[PDB]
């Protein structure tokens with residue numbers, strides 16, 4: 128039993144809710160919140176910009192030190208950093224950005240990072256400003272993640288379309 132509330136159950140391990148991931152994280156304080164990161168951990172907009180703003184830019188400060196030490200992530204890769212005031216940890220995961228021409232096949236590799244964590248609060252990878260089809264992202268999530276994932280979908284219209292079209 129966990130404290131996630133109001134989710135629709137899609138499969139044995141995948142759950143979904145129309146919610147602002149920032150507000151969800153502040154309420155639940157999950158062990159892991161997933162960020163929709165880029166390889167430079169520049170958290171300018173989309174989910175990343177919102178999560179970083181909620182940390183009063185502490186996420187960005189920590190991220191800049193991470194990059195200065197380690198260099199950029201790989202597309203499809205991840206790193207674990209602090210969750211600040213939102214979660215114990217933040218798993219920064221880089222899905223492919225279609226608006227940069229990146230290979231959508233890398234979306235499966237990106238979701239594989241979730242399997243290293245027993246329970247996660249997450250957005251749909253490569254959705255929103257990353258330009259992929261969110262219906263496809265949900266399909267890859269369900270077919271790749273085996274750990275318990277709670278998906279937060281900001282847009283109510285999109286949430287309804289994701290539920291109604293789910294096979």
Ligand SMILES: O=C(Nc1ccsc1C(=O)O)c1ccc2c(c1)OCO2
Pocket residue numbers: 147148149163172173174175177250251252253254255256261279280281282285
């Ligand atoms: O980019 C966002 N979400 C996202 C990303 C890929 S899918 C997806 C979704 O919610 O379906 C996002 C979430 C919450 C926000 C925000 C942006 O700005 C203020 O609060």
